[PDB]
Structure 1
Amino acid sequence: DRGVSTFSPEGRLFQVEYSLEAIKLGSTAIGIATKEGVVLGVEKRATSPLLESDSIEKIVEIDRHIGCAMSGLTADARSMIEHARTAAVTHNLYYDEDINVESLTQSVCDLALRFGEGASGEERLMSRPFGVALLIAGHDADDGYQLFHAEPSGTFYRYNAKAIGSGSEGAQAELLNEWHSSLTLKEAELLVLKILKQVMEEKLDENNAQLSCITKQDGFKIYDNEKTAELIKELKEKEAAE
């Protein structure tokens, strides 16, 4: 029975900290950094077979070279990405050059703070705050393949890699154990599958999940339904071997 802009005797707000467990209802969504590329992964939460999962799009493409993956509540985040696309392109105009990631992502977490005294001179839109959080991945030529994390409380961190959502508290422990510096790309195109195969409520298919790499050479790329399947056999090339 609390409101928005009111503290507690303990100081810990109610609603935003309640907004920090709605994500734990949603799907899973992971991306992991390699110094030659970064991955992205999903759990479709496909509820019925007749469905055509080409339409469900938990993965996007900001530009030819940046992509993100929304988790928790997939509906609302469909709005904010159009913000990012606006600031990306807008910055592609005034300077004739792709943007650094940290110049962007401050904006997005400067949006969700708008429910009361946003940036300098901000009228309070957003009666309630975004009940969704997501991951940002891509290159800029100053720091490296600096993944970024966003949550609607209005802050961002930089990561090597971690997870969200349902399998958060358990799955990341394996990731915390099994990341390092000198690994490959495709080892990360498959290590996720060792993980996501844990916390799916059914045997994996080529359609439960889907993947997308990211490269300073080509740029952005989503895979196909089959080209996940071939590596799963490659995982079973180790699951059957070991």
Structure 2
Amino acid sequence: GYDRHITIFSPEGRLYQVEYAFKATNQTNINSLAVRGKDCTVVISQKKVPDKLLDPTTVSYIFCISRTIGMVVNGPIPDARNAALRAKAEAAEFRYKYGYDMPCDVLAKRMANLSQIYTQRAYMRPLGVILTFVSVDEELGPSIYKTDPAGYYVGYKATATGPKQQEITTNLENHFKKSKIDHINEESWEKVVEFAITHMIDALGTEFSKNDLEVGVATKDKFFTLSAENIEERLVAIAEQ
């Protein structure tokens, strides 16, 4: 009856309403690749704009939730904004009541808990976005925590998201198999961008441009994004590798 139309349990014990949320985040066809450097965390994501009449600069999916913590969104942009707004509010609040800015771990856990509550309520629809939170914390180092629409999250050595993310997994797996460590041993953050772009080309078979890329880098104690001019320096630097 309503075991697939609201968030109540079925005879299977599996919530069909929740499953549908994960079947809408891959329909925007945005891939992400996120790697932990030795001093940084770099995340690159697709930014396919097929129109002359959309301004590509304002088409974005990397939202700065703290000054140190970036968030990259795979899935629909209404739900992205709502989850960004809520996350920013909480991160500010944490500074206010605990006297230091919210960790990546706990910010992930907080959105995770709200996602469960949104699938507890039968009239509230969960936010159907996969959120990757990249940072460099001083108590956790370079970190990636990835929350999902259900309310599950875990840490990561590296992670990918999108429909074609299995291909990305193959590259990352080889990289950390050979190195025998959970991060990239590269001490320049710029070259971790260069590496990330290389494996994106390998995985998807797609040759990238500066207007198909959007790059976020968390270094120690600051988060910035590269502009398309800076991303072009990296694309020229692939030829110099």
On whether the aligned pair clears a TM of 0.5, the verdict is yes
What SS does structure 2 have at the residue aligned with 1:10? coil
Does residue 135 of structure 2 align to residue 138 of structure 1?
yes
Aligned residue for 1:193?
197
Which one-letter code corresponds to 2:104 in the other structure?
Answer: V
Matched, 1:114 2:111: no
1:38-90 C-alpha deviation (Å, 9 max, x unpaired): 10111112112343211112111112211110112122120111111111111
CA-based RMSD of the aligned residues comes to 2.2
**Equivalence for 1:69:** 72
2:74/2:131 contact within 8 Å kept: yes
Deviations 1:139-172 (CA, angstroms, capped at 9, x unpaired): 3332222210010111101001110112212221
Q: In the alignment, is residue 167 of structure 1 matched against residue 164 of structure 2?
A: yes
The one of 224, 233, 236 equivalent to 2:227 is 224
The offset of 1:6, in angstroms, is 3.3
Structure 2: which 5+ residue stretches go unaligned? none
- Is this contact kept in 1: 2:44–2:214, CA < 8 A? yes
Q: How far, CA to CA, are the matches of 1:186 and 1:116 in structure 2?
A: 40
The yes-or-no answer on 1:205 pairing with 2:209 is yes
SS of equivalent residue, structure 1 residue 187: helix
Instruction: Give the deviation of 1:12 after TM superposition.
Output: 2.9
Give aligned pairs, total. 231
My pick for the range that moved more, 50-59 or 191-200, is 191-200
Do the aligned partners of 1:43 and 1:200 also contact (CA within 8 Å) in 2?
Answer: no
Taking every aligned residue pair, what percent have the same amino acid on both sides? 24
Structure 1 residue 198, shift from structure 2 partner: 4.7
Give the whole-Å Cα distance in 2 for the aligned partners of 1:61 and 1:237: 31
Q: 1:16 aligns with which of 15, 18, 21?
A: 18
Matched-pair contact (CA < 8 Å) for 1:99–1:140: no
- Tell me, what secondary structure is at the counterpart of 1:57? coil
User: What CA deviation, in whole Å up to 9, does each residue of 1:106-162 have, x standing for no partner?
Assistant: 111111112354xxxxxx486222111110011333222221001011110100111
TM-score, normalised relative to structure 1: 0.86
Which residue among 43, 46, 50 is the counterpart of 2:49?
Answer: 46
State the AA in 2 paired with 1:16: V
1:99 aligns with one of 98, 102, 106: 102
Which residue matches 2:219?
Answer: 215
